[PDB]
Structure formats: C-alpha cells, structure tokens
Design a protein around this ligand. Structure first.
Ligand SMILES: NS(=O)(=O)c1cccc(Nc2ncc3ccc4sc(-c5ccccc5)cc4c3n2)c1
Length: 246
C-alpha cells in the first residue's frame, strides 16, 4: 500500500463520475496537483479496492500514470494519481483536430505501445484499451491509465470473452485508428450486430488520411482474426519505431 494519505488533500473541482466514485482535480500538501479518484460507498468491495490499488502501485513505467498513494482510513476511500494536464487522449485529439502532424500522432501510438508492452510483460491484461482511457501530460506524452465496448473487442472477445494481451493488441489497433482519424468514432453508424458482421466478413476500419500506408499495414496486423497472427506489443513497439523514422 506504499503510502497512505489522510487529509493532506485539497479537492478543487470534480472531473469525472459513474458509480465507482467521483474524480477530482486536487492538491496534496498544498503543492502537488493530483487527480483524486474517490469510490462511492458500497460500489466496490474493500478487498477489490485494496487488491486493485496494490497492483497499480506495483506497476511502474514512464508511460503508465503514477499514483501518489491511497486514502483508506475511510472518508471515503480513494486513489491519488499524478495529475495529467491535458486530460483524455480522445478529447485531446478531437479539440486539437487539424493541428497534428502525422509524426506527432505516430509518436502518441508509440507511447501507448511502450506502456502496453510493459503491462504485457507483466502479464497484465488491460481489457479496455481505448483512447478515452489514455491521458495526455504536458508535452503531449501519452500515458496508459485504468490499467489495474464491442467496437474495441477482438473476435474471441465478443465471442468467448477470451481476453489476452493479443486481444489488447486488437484494441490498440482501434486506438491507433482513433489517433489517426484525430478522434473520430469507430463504426459510428453501425450497431453491435453490424460491427460483428462486418468484422466477421473481413471488413476493417478505413484508413484515416493522416495514416500512411505503412501505419495502416500495422493497424491491420493488430486486426488479424487470429490472436496468434497478431504481434505481441513487444514486437509491435519495434515495428512502429522503425516506421516512425520515415
Ligand atoms: N478525465 S477528464 O475529465 O477528461 C480530465 C480533464 C483534465 C485533466 C485530467 N487529468 C487526469 N490526470 C490523472 C488521472 C488518473 C486517474 C483518472 S480517472 C479519470 C476519469 C474516470 C472516469 C470518468 C472521467 C474521468 C481521470 C483520471 C485522471 N485525469 C482529466
């Protein structure tokens, strides 16, 4: 539980919600800007919160959002993360649409891939890798969050709820699509059924204009019907890294 926080927290304004709790922009010790995630009483068992926080504090990577600590003396319970200045990647891409060079967008994908490669190696399955679950820090660094939606699901996921790092990769491909379309909604005008049919028939998200043919190729490797046919994040990372240089 590396560092338990009492009330050295200043709650400034809330920024999120949804039974689980509320999210607040705050300050710890009147100095460090933080995002405080509080949990609604009786919205999560205590051992789930406890075992979850320990996992997130055991994980450490430059591309994974860091935790300052947790509050559990009850008041209610909460998690204290470092504050990511520019919010969620989805919102960021949308409001900044038209101001991105392709290199920038590719750089964003590489950030996410590094954090994902790290989690992969740590045998951690994300299960909800989407641009909305990624955060933008100052200088456009992207960090994966919420690491500890059939539009992002691989076939074995909407069929067997069979999660793995390989299903995460598929999700990463869709995230790549979100990044290059500059925040567009994938399969915006299609129901679950239509998405499942289209995907099952071999259709894939169209190539965004900012996505080079080489970037799109990688996106399609992530969307290979067979998990074993998709590259592991460790491999993807180097593929993206080479393309980035041109
Ligand atoms: N998430 S947001 O409201 O777009 C936003 C705006 C401006 C700055 C941030 N920064 C930040 N930094 C570190 C974080 C680390 C934890 C969480 S959980 C969360 C959330 C959850 C459930 C619904 C809505 C938001 C945002 C953040 C978080 N957020 C977030």
């Amino acid at each position: 539980h590396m560092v338990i926080d009492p009330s050295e927290l200043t709650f400034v304004q809330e920024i999120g919600s949804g039974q689980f709790g509320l999210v607040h922009l705050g300050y710890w010790l009147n100095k460090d800007k933080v995002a405080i995630k509080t949990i609604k009483e009786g919205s999560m068992s205590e051992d789930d919160f406890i075992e979850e926080a320990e996992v997130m504090m055991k994980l450490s990577h430059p591309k994974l959002v860091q935790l300052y600590g947790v509050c559990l003396e009850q008041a209610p319970i909460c998690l204290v993360f470092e504050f990511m200045e520019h919010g969620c990647l989805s919102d960021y891409l949308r409001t900044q649409r038209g101001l991105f060079a392709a290199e920038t967008l590719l750089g964003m994908c590489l950030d996410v891939c590094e954090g994902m490669a790290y989690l992969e190696e740590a045998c951690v399955i994300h299960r909800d890798l989407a641009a909305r679950n990624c955060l933008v820090g100052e200088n456009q660094v992207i960090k994966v969050s919420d690491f500890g939606p059939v539009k992002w699901a691989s076939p074995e996921v909407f069929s067997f709820s069979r999660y793995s790092s390989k299903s995460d990769v598929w999700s990463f491909g869709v995230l790549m699509w979100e990044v290059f379309s500059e925040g567009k909604i994938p399969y915006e005008n299609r129901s679950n059924s239509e998405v499942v049919e289209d995907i099952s028939t071999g259709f894939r998200l169209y190539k965004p204009r900012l996505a080079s043919t080489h970037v799109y190729q990688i996106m399609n490797h992530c969307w290979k019907e067979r998990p074993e046919d998709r590259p592991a994040f460790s491999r993807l990372l180097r593929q993206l890294a080479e393309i980035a240089e041109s």
